[PDB]
Design a protein around this ligand. Structure first.
Ligand SMILES: *[C@@H]1O[C@H](CO)[C@@H](O)[C@H](O)[C@H]1NC(C)=O
Length: 246
C-alpha cells in the first residue's frame, strides 16, 4: 500500500507519495529507461491500495489497477464505490470485500463521462493539494454529481502525477493554492496512451516514432513529438502503458 496525508503536506511529502506510488507499480522491463507496465496481472495482485487522509485525518482507500494506473473504486468508511465499467466490476471481486455495502457509481471512469457527470470540463476544475483535501472529504459522503468532480481531481493529482513528472511539479506548485490545470497538463493526460505506444514502437525504429504525437508545451504552443530525444521522453514520462493494452 501507499499513503498520503494532507495534514502537514508540502511539496516534499507530496513528492515522496508520488515516488511511492510509482515504485509500487511492478515492471520487468524499461523501455528507453522508463518502466514498462505489465501486460496483465492476475488476482488481487492487480490492485494497489492508496490510503489518503484529508486534513482532519479522515481517510479513503483508493484501488488502482497496477497495469494502467486506472482508479477502479474506493472505500469510504464501510461503503465501497466502483465505476460503472467491467474492469471495476472485476476489481470489486478482489478489493473492499469487507465493506458493508457496495455502490456502483452512475458513470465509468473515463474523463469524458466524468466531465459530463460533473457538469464541467476539467479545464475549469482547479487542482492542487487543497483540491485533493476537498476531494477526499467529498468522497466520504455519497453524492454522485459532487463525486465526479472530486474524482477528476483525484485522478489528476495521483495517477496523472505518477505518469508525468511535469504534472507532479504542477501539483507541487499548487500545494497551498489550487489552479486549473495548464493546457500542457491536459495534453499530456490525453496523450499518455499515444506516447506509451510510440515510445515502445521506437524500440525497433531507431528511436523514431512511427506516428508523431502532438502536444501543447508550457508556453501554450502546440508541438510535434517525433522521437525519443524529446524532453517529454527523456525527462517527463515516468511510466509506459504496455502496448498490449492499447
Ligand atoms: C528528433 O527530436 C529532436 C528533439 O525534439 C529534434 O530536435 C530533431 O529534429 C528530431 N530528430 C529526428 C531524427 O527526428
Amino acid at each position: 500500500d501507499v499513503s498520503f496525508r494532507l495534514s502537514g503536506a508540502d511539496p516534499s511529502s507530496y513528492g515522496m507519495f508520488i515516488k511511492d506510488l510509482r515504485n509500487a507499480l511492478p515492471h520487468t522491463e524499461k523501455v528507453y529507461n522508463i518502466p514498462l507496465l505489465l501486460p496483465s496481472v492476475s488476482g488481487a495482485g492487480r490492485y494497489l491500495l492508496m490510503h489518503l487522509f484529508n486534513y482532519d485525518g479522515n481517510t479513503i482507500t483508493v484501488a488502482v489497477d497496477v497495469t494502467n494506473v486506472y482508479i477502479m473504486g474506493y472505500l469510504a468508511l464501510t461503503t465501497s464505490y466502483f465505476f460503472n465499467e467491467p474492469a471495476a466490476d472485476l476489481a470489486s471481486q478482489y478489493v473492499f470485500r469487507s465493506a458493508r455495502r457496495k455502490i456502483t457509481l452512475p458513470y465509468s471512469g473515463n474523463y469524458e463521462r466524468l466531465q459530463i457527470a460533473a457538469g464541467k470540463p476539467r479545464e475549469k476544475i482547479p487542482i492542487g493539494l487543497p483540491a485533493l483535501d476537498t476531494a477526499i472529504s467529498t468522497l466520504l459522503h455519497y453524492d454522485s454529481t459532487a463525486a465526479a468532480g472530486a474524482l477528476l481531481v483525484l485522478i489528476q493529482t495521483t495517477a496523472e502525477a505518477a505518469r508525468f513528472k511535469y504534472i507532479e511539479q504542477q501539483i507541487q506548485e499548487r500545494a497551498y493554492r489550487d489552479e486549473v490545470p495548464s493546457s500542457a497538463t491536459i495534453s499530456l493526460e490525453n496523450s499518455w496512451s499515444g506516447l506509451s505506444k510510440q515510445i515502445q514502437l521506437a524500440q525497433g525504429n531507431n528511436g523514431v516514432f512511427r506516428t508523431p504525437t502532438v502536444l501543447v508545451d508550457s508556453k501554450g504552443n502546440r508541438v510535434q513529438i517525433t522521437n525519443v530525444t524529446s524532453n517529454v521522453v527523456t525527462s517527463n514520462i515516468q511510466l509506459l502503458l504496455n502496448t498490449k493494452n492499447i
